[PDB]
């Protein structure tokens with residue numbers, strides 16, 4: 215019993231964190247096999263960030279200008295290349311701590327753990343969601359760039375995110391491990407708009423199922439609804455429209471609790487229209503959307 | 519910018535997790551140097567838990583009855599002893615992954631990271647507080663017993679908690695690494711009362727300081743208060759009385775923000791008396807008490 219915002223154990227990722235220095239800028243890199251991945255803005259100075267020509271900037275750099283340090287040992291850089299917004303530094307040594315891994319581009323609404331790092335050293339781990347507007351509400355300071363987001367399936371680490379930038383609104387933006395930004399963001403010191411962000415409806419419903427399982431049932435009512443009626447309410451409250459695909463992934467939780475998905479939707483509809491009236495659900499006074507249906511199943515069954 | 523419920527990187531602790539089996543019961547153990555620590559209830563059957571005589575139960579067991587498995591390799595048990603509510607299994611091999619460590623008994627209101635484990639395998643990491651009533655609101659299932667709570671200071675892991683029991687109210691109880699329970703709990707299948715739990719006032723004030731630093735300032739008002747006036751309000755709302763010691767630890771945050779501690783108390787007083795009026799602070803619709811003043815300083819400065 216109990217429900218927590220749980221992150222994956224960060225050990226396999228800690229063994230991959232390195233510090234990358236280029237000139238005066240230092241940030242985090244990910245050392246997998248004989249390649250170090252880091253944000254390409256490591257090659258910029260503060261003046262460059264206003265409007266960087268990354269190709270021209272990288273041309274003034276050689277293998278010896280990239281200082282890669284793993285813990286306390288220096289790695290020899292024998293190759294460098296830019297792929298989208300990431301730099302790939304070929305080193306002469308394969309990381310002995312390289313776990314089984316994959317690079318994956320996650321979908322908005324999906325969750326992942328973040329290992330926040332400074333100077334190649336891990337400082338903390340937290341669980342977050344990729345917002346529908348492709349931003350993350352992380353906790354990152356200067357020096358955190360290159361910190362990564364991941365998921366773990368038994369022994370395989372699926373890297374999904376690399377931190378690049380804090381928008382003027384305090385929210386965060388980054389790339390997949392191929393250097394493609396999630397969202398319309400560019401790695402430039404210019405005001406950039408994150409779109410209107412919506413609440414991840416399917417995740418809120420999954421979290422209401424987690425609440426029923428853990429004993430918080432006060433919100434369950436004698437009502438039901440339809441996908442069309444519920445979506446009229448979701449639209450009014452800036453919730454993502456619920457589709458049959460979302461209903462299908464809620465199936466295991468609906469089977470476990472015996473509460474049909476559309477019945478849970480009617481509870482959510484009443485919570486949206488009436489608020490919580492000063493009550494809490496799973497220790498929260500608001501509707502939580504950072505737990506996918508898979509996260510609820512994993513946590514509620516103890517998957518290691 | 520941004521403020522998250524961040525846990526310590528769990529890597530140094532993952533390398534210590536083992537599975538301990540005794541008869542038909544399996545739970546988690548902590549392998550440090552040549553000793554495996556686990557809850558003593560590993561020696562009980564379901565029938566024993568109603569009223570166990572642990573000394574009599576342990577006498578029927580020999581070194582060979584304790585099956586300790588680290589990952590996939592078996593450890594040879596050469597000694598066994600009971601210290602309070604923990605079993606200490608001497609193994610013939612020192613854990614090569616033993617980090618620098620200490621055993622510490624934490625105070626109520628202090629925070630720590632938990633590495634939830636099943637069959638000696640880590641499944642998740644979350645940050646929590648030891649409640650003033652010595653319980654923790656964790657996320658633990660059957661098989662999680664022996665999962666540990668810790669803090670990390672540079673390279674030293676301070677182990678502070680071992681999970682033993684879920685109370686009939688869904689809250690959790692456990693021991694320090696010397697087997698002493700936090701609270702009045704006994705490792706027995708009997709209804710046990712956790713006292714009245716209060717909100718950790720100093721942690722809420724530290725979190726309001728984290729809010730001001732990150733931009734959420736709407737709650738700041740034109741008022742001030744005294745320790746005695748504030749404590750009258752704290753008493754009414756079941757908040758821990760604030761002492762000069764608490765004011766002293768809030769000093770660094772007060773210096774950083776330029777908001778005197780008693781001015782922050784007046785904001786908290788108005789929030790307690792008026793609620794949030796539908797607003798949020800750091801993405802929360804309630805007053806958060808799981809961040810100590812040290813956690814706010816560490817997170818807001820990027821301590822690795």
Ligand SMILES: Cc1ccncc1NC(=O)Cc1cccc(Cl)c1
Nearest residue numbers: 255354355356378379380401402403
């Ligand atoms: C200071 C900080 C805080 C949190 N995360 C990240 C940062 N750093 C930056 O955003 C630096 C920067 C500036 C313009 C473009 C890019 Cl790609 C990166």
Ligand SMILES: Cc1ccncc1NC(=O)Cc1cccc(Cl)c1
Nearest residue numbers: 559658659660682683684705706707
């Ligand atoms: C089932 C479960 C869920 C979460 N944490 C722990 C558990 N397990 C137990 O509480 C088992 C037990 C029973 C009576 C006394 C003691 Cl010390 C331990």
